[PDB]
Predict the structure of Glycosyl hydrolase family 16.
Amino acid sequence: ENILFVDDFDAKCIVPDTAIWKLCTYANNAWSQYFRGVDGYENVKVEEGYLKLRACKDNGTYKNGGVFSKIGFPCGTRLEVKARLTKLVRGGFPAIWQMPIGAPEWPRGGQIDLMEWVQGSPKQIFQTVHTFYINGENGSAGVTNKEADKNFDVTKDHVYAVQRTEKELIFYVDGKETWKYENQHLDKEKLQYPFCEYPFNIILNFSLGGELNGMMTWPGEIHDEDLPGEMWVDWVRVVLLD
Ligand SMILES: CC(=O)N[C@H]1[C@H](O[C@@H]2[C@@H](O)[C@H](O)O[C@H](CO)[C@@H]2O)O[C@H](CO)[C@@H](O[C@@H]2O[C@H](CO)[C@H](O)[C@H](O)[C@H]2O)[C@@H]1O
Ligand SMILES: [Ca+2]
Ligand code: NA
Ligand code: NA
């Protein structure tokens, strides 16, 4: 099987590979708002074969932990990520996902979420597709997998995967297919399937929710007493398909 990229996070270093992995930065949205004033690698380390991403509160200030790949991947590929949460955190918002590189403004270039967790459904994860066709100017939910295992322990290791081709996206958990999002071969102007127009990166983060500009976010209310939380990523792999 053809390995286009792999990181086992087992390099003789205390931070993830500095050529591949960049620290996440502040932006006025739910997942990014608490990268503000995160000092370098304070919430991000490599240790005992894991990337360890921490979310915590530091003298009044919520701080996220996350990195994104500077490298990205074409179509005809499958991304596999092994990860667990150390615990459930109320208001915690950990994610394993992909953004297009150099695409028009979100959500026009698309977005793929291999894993998200929120306190509102604590014994499940979400696998989600975003496009301008789905979301338009006003939508943020995307299309998510409704038959998601309802009886599932996020604090154990799982392998989250998406296979991306011109035909479709196929999601997996622990090597079992969960759902697919098909190319409908519509007018290019509808932007229904942008997933081969730009390379997609890898994003790994443990973010905190609560209010954004006075509106409650999907991950809901932050319970300070539950903090800190960590996501441990054992490995990331991108395979070239047949
Ligand atoms: C509604 C929203 O917050 N959208 C931002 C998007 O969010 C992701 C969600 O769509 C989804 O729930 O999965 C992940 C993991 O939890 C994120 O929460 O993220 C993108 C990429 O960061 C944002 O696009 C960026 O917006 C900023 C300004 O806010 C900037 O314009 C940048 O150019 C753009 O890429 C969505 O706003
Ligand atoms: Ca590892
Ligand atoms: Na790095
Ligand atoms: Na999701």
